[PDB]
Amino acid sequence: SDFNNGWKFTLSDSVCYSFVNYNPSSWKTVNLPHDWSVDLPFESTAEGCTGFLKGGIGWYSKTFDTPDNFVDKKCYIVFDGVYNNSEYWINGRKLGFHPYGYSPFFYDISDYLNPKGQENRISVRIDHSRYADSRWYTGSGIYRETQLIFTDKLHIPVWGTFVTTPVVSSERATVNIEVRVKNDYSGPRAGEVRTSYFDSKNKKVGEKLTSFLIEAGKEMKINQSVEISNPSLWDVDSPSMYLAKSEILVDGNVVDTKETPFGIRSIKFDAKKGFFLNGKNMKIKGVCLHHDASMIGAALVEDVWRRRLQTLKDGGCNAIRLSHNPGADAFLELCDEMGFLVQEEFFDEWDYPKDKRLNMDEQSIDYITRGYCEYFQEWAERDLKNVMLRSRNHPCIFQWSIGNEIEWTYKGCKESTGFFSYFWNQPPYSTQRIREEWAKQPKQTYDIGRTAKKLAAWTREMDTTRPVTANCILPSISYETGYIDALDVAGFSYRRVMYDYAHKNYPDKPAMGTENLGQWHEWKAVIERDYIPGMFIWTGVDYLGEVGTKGREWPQRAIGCGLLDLAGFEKPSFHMMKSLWTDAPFIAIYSQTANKSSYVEKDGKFTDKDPKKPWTQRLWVWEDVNSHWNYTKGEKVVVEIYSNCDEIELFQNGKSLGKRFLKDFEDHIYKWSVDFKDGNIVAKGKKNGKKTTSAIYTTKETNSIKLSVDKVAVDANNTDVIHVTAQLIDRNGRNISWEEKEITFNIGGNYRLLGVENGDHLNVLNYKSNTVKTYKGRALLVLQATDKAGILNINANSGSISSNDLKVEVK
């Protein structure tokens, strides 16, 4: 835990940094996890696919003494992730090179260590000079937590257990564990593996003891099976966790221990009926999450994600797709605790590169976009298996995904359909015709089907208890290459129109939405079909990058497709999804000028403005709708409600505007023509009896800054964070969202600025400033505690505008 503290770092290269006699004292001290690229300003001379932030070549360093009892023992240094092309040294000796940015790995450093009490030094060189080597923002550095593990020479390896539960019922659960035991002694050894099982409230619920005899140098696999009675099942509403404590015994003495958290749960994908979790037919209400926040970047700070996931959770989301790479262990541990089903991805591309600046097949070749494709042939198996070795015990995981939108990169695929000679239509070619066009294409060095088979084979060597999936952008062809035949569940990417086609032509293959637009028409298609068990919205939260393209130039730093923004504040699209996914009565009120709106009332009924852009084809980014009620007097306005209520009556200033029914609105958006005047809009709604009310009030000028805080007390553990929300209010404390202000925060006491954020995807801002422009009347400040305990006094200004005062105790 504390091994992650007190590292050194410099953004500069020199060969002599690896030598035994080099001292890095004049480098900057840092705590891991660290992403250096968010200490650099957004530069216009950088690339937009990686969010206009540079990389470069940075080094790390870490000093640690050999323990006073390092005799007949092993020492392993474990990294969860380093982005990327990293080289490792210890005490002047080269440990290795690790190309991929997202796989975990480790090094046996036991023989390299200096005698008891003396100083060892580790060095890491990180080459992110290819700073456009991704379609999204990556970060740069040791961006996830590390471990230094000391064990006995008779020990369980790192990731040395695998807990499975093949039979799960409410009376009993069969809980198996495989324990690997490595004998690094010079001669044979005898012992016992004792695995004890502990429930949520620390009561012992099972034990198994098995003898063994392992020869010198070798590894042995010990299978054990127990029966847990009346188990607490892991579910998204009730995420119960057990603890498996495996102990190596010589005589009756504990030589080594590993603790494996696990959860008891059955999962099943039926092709006719949908998906089943503990025998409940539930829809998957998923969202795609990139690994970056905004101000912290790729750095895995658990409290920053906890808040983001808590907001997604309360919006009715029960699943997360880690797009498009392996996630952090700390993030998986969070999904276990909070209750999310997790699809873990391995790769974004296989044998051939995607275009980093554009998308699809790569067009140009230059240095800064050279990605993992250089290493895939030699490294894919190691990376895939390490990911699975690290993550296969987490109960949250329920799908291994081998690829995202891979069809673009192999010649013949797109042209074997009839589309490109596709979003809203089915292939013009028949099943046999597509198959026949595929025979006629020129043979390349690599085949999508053959590589799909190898990856799926490797995946199943490590785990058969979870389905192999993939995100297929062209199902039609992938149904006939052997790519889909490799998978247990075929994920579709933006192919709602292909749901009936899968069910018509390939009915025994479970199929699902794995990347989808955040709209009702996508969800409509899922709930109308029992055989389509859910969808994953692109995206759950806004992410840096995928900009610098035609209509998304500097200074835009994110697309803005996310349900949440770069802060984690709720957007209109989040509320629309909340209305589709939650059960409690819900009403969110928005509006635009009748001119700026997408909708038109002609003779009562509402329709879409452009018939060539109807509600059935709405894409990723939601319209910039207003939540305020501060228009200019008399302006013609279109009010729109997102809601699960069957009846809503609307009231302007107390005068009724009339009841409207959800049955009428084909696009699932309530709509009212209104003539503006000051006062208030109030919506009252009923859902199968149960009532609810919401309202938007006209305000006066900006009078004050309202500061909210999420926690009024945290620990002095160098990791806990404070989230300070700033909001503009009028004289009577009504919230302002129609004018912006440059706000300056002031903080007394010992703290670390993580940064400031407003959630504007269209503009850049300095994260490490104490000043930030508000967006729709609000901003966010993120602080992190440090070593020092004390009190924090937080206030803010905008020149003449003042704020309430907040106090937070750091215990």
XYZ file of N, CA, C and O in Angstrom, residues 48 191 227 313 362 442 490 509 518 551 560 568 637 642 644 700:
64
model
N -5.478 15.454 -31.597
C -6.825 15.471 -31.031
C -7.389 14.109 -30.663
O -8.258 14.012 -29.796
N 3.649 -30.723 2.463
C 2.816 -29.728 3.122
C 1.328 -29.980 3.014
O 0.886 -31.052 2.592
N -18.963 -27.184 0.158
C -20.375 -26.856 0.051
C -20.688 -25.716 1.030
O -20.612 -25.904 2.239
N -25.197 4.330 -11.190
C -26.026 3.375 -10.433
C -27.420 3.937 -10.152
O -28.421 3.281 -10.434
N -6.249 1.775 -41.344
C -5.220 2.820 -41.312
C -4.874 3.269 -42.727
O -4.773 2.446 -43.632
N -8.938 -11.441 -52.180
C -7.540 -11.881 -52.087
C -7.118 -12.277 -50.659
O -7.483 -11.613 -49.689
N -22.410 -13.140 -29.467
C -22.047 -12.143 -30.479
C -22.568 -10.772 -30.069
O -23.772 -10.556 -30.018
N -27.454 -18.685 -31.680
C -26.342 -17.854 -31.203
C -26.867 -16.708 -30.350
O -27.548 -15.833 -30.871
N -26.930 6.370 -27.085
C -27.732 6.680 -25.906
C -29.060 7.317 -26.265
O -29.228 8.522 -26.095
N -15.410 18.256 -37.988
C -16.234 19.199 -37.219
C -15.985 19.261 -35.716
O -16.872 19.681 -34.977
N -18.476 14.505 -26.322
C -19.678 14.887 -25.575
C -20.831 13.898 -25.688
O -21.991 14.274 -25.488
N -18.466 14.593 -14.013
C -19.366 13.606 -13.415
C -20.758 14.162 -13.125
O -21.561 13.483 -12.482
N -41.472 28.905 -26.848
C -40.616 27.875 -26.245
C -41.265 26.499 -26.422
O -42.491 26.376 -26.392
N -38.551 14.369 -19.856
C -38.140 12.969 -19.901
C -38.677 12.318 -18.627
O -38.419 12.807 -17.520
N -40.861 8.529 -16.777
C -41.491 7.205 -16.778
C -42.975 7.256 -16.397
O -43.627 6.217 -16.349
N -33.318 35.680 -10.563
C -32.768 37.024 -10.725
C -31.280 36.911 -11.070
O -30.792 35.812 -11.358
